[PDB]
Design a protein around this ligand. Structure first.
Ligand SMILES: Nc1nccc(-c2c(-c3ccc(F)cc3)ncn2C2CCNCC2)n1
Ligand SMILES: O=C(Nc1cccc(N2C(=O)C=CC2=O)c1)c1ccco1
Ligand SMILES: [Ca+2]
Ligand SMILES: [Ca+2]
Ligand SMILES: [Ca+2]
Length: 344
């Protein structure tokens, strides 16, 4: 293919002539993104140019990790790949990686900001998050930083999870075990985040808008109640345990008294997601069966993922080895069919 060059976000992009009318739509993890028109299919796409993908061993393995992950993700509520390209003609010239996915116009913050969402609409949005999480969790992939800005949404409220499995970030949606560096955690860290997101969609305001990690913890404990000693088991730092143990004891609030006017089924689901005991937190697959989603739930259309080989994560390789592995993954990529779905 013929490539052309265009300066976007103060840097040269070099893209196949197939992709036209590039225009910037913001940064993503380790890269920046442009909307484009795919002249082969007439579809709108988003093209991410990775930032300095092989500048260091950190960047190089992160590039490989992201390409491997995105090549594996094949789910309607998870960002996956339509294309991956490089202007390089050989491994020796290889220094740039571009990832292509279907264009999504907004993030979840664009949906709830200026709109009082109906409960039926909130159900649909949360249902889609949970369907995507069931899929990624089934491949032993955790998001760990799920939040509205990591949920891409289009003009019909269809949603996809992105930046999973990988500047001052919001911590308002992070699971307590992540935010506070507890020693062990499971996939349900992401379910805490869903509870935080769902709460905000129902009330129109942030559930735990803490100014720092201690203020955020205090806000969390005010809702869910002081935890037992067994939860201290998870916290390495004695200073942190002593502090938490020293706090005045707070009762758990009845969520029906907090989310006044909400669908009682929404309140019940929130009670099952927003628990400190991550081993008692509802899983994505269990949440999909909850009656709150009755009008959307369809077990035939809530698939799991093919097994995902993450053995590379434990390996230290040289930069050029990660670069060569990445090049191999670029060259071996097989574009999916344009239409991969059939009537039920
Ligand atoms: N507009 C849009 N549409 C789809 C995805 C993205 C996208 C990507 C991304 C990831 C992989 C890929 F192959 C191509 C693009 N990374 C961050 N974003 C965000 C850009 C600003 N916030 C919303 C999504 N942006
Ligand atoms: O007080 C607020 N929201 C709120 C608080 C508590 C409850 C509900 N709520 C439900 O949970 C469902 C409908 C509804 O109004 C909404 C608020 C938002 C912006 C400024 O103040
Ligand atoms: Ca269906
Ligand atoms: Ca069916
Ligand atoms: Ca079809």
């Amino acid at each position: 293919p013929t490539f052309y060059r265009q300066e976007l976000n103060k840097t040269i992009w070099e893209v196949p002539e197939r992709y036209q009318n590039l225009s910037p739509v913001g940064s993503g993890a380790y890269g920046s993104v442009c909307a484009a028109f795919d002249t082969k299919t007439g579809h709108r796409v988003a093209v991410k140019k990775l930032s300095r993908p092989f500048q260091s061993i950190i960047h190089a393995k992160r590039t490989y990790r992201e390409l491997r992950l995105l090549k594996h993700m094949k789910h309607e509520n998870v960002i996956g790949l339509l294309d991956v390209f490089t202007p390089a003609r050989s491994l020796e010239e290889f220094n740039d990686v571009y990832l292509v996915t279907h264009l999504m116009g907004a993030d979840l913050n664009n949906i709830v900001k200026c709109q009082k969402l109906t409960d039926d609409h909130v159900q649909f949005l949360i249902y889609q998050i949970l369907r995507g999480l069931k899929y990624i969790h089934s491949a032993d992939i955790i998001h760990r930083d799920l939040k509205p800005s990591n949920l891409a949404v289009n003009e019909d409220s269809e949603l996809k999870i992105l930046d999973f499995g990988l500047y001052v970030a919001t911590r308002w949606y992070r699971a307590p075990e992540i935010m506070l560096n507890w020693m062990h955690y499971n996939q349900t860290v992401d379910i805490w985040s869903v509870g935080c997101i769902m709460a905000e969609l129902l009330t129109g305001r942030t559930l735990f808008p803490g100014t720092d990690h201690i203020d955020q913890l205090k806000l969390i404990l005010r809702l869910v109640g002081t935890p037992g000693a067994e939860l201290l088991k998870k916290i390495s730092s004695e200073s942190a345990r002593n502090y938490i143990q020293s706090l005045a004891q707070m009762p758990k609030m009845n969520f029906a008294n907090v989310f006044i006017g909400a669908n009682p089924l929404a309140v019940d689901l929130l009670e099952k997601m927003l628990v400190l005991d991550s081993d008692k937190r509802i899983t994505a697959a269990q949440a999909l069966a909850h009656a709150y989603f009755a009008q959307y739930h369809d077990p035939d259309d809530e698939p799991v993922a093919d097994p995902y080989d993450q053995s590379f994560e434990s390996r230290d390789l040289l930069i050029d080895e990660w670069k060569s592995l990445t090049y191999d993954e670029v060259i071996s990529f097989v574009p999916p069919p344009l239409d991969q779905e059939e009537m039920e």
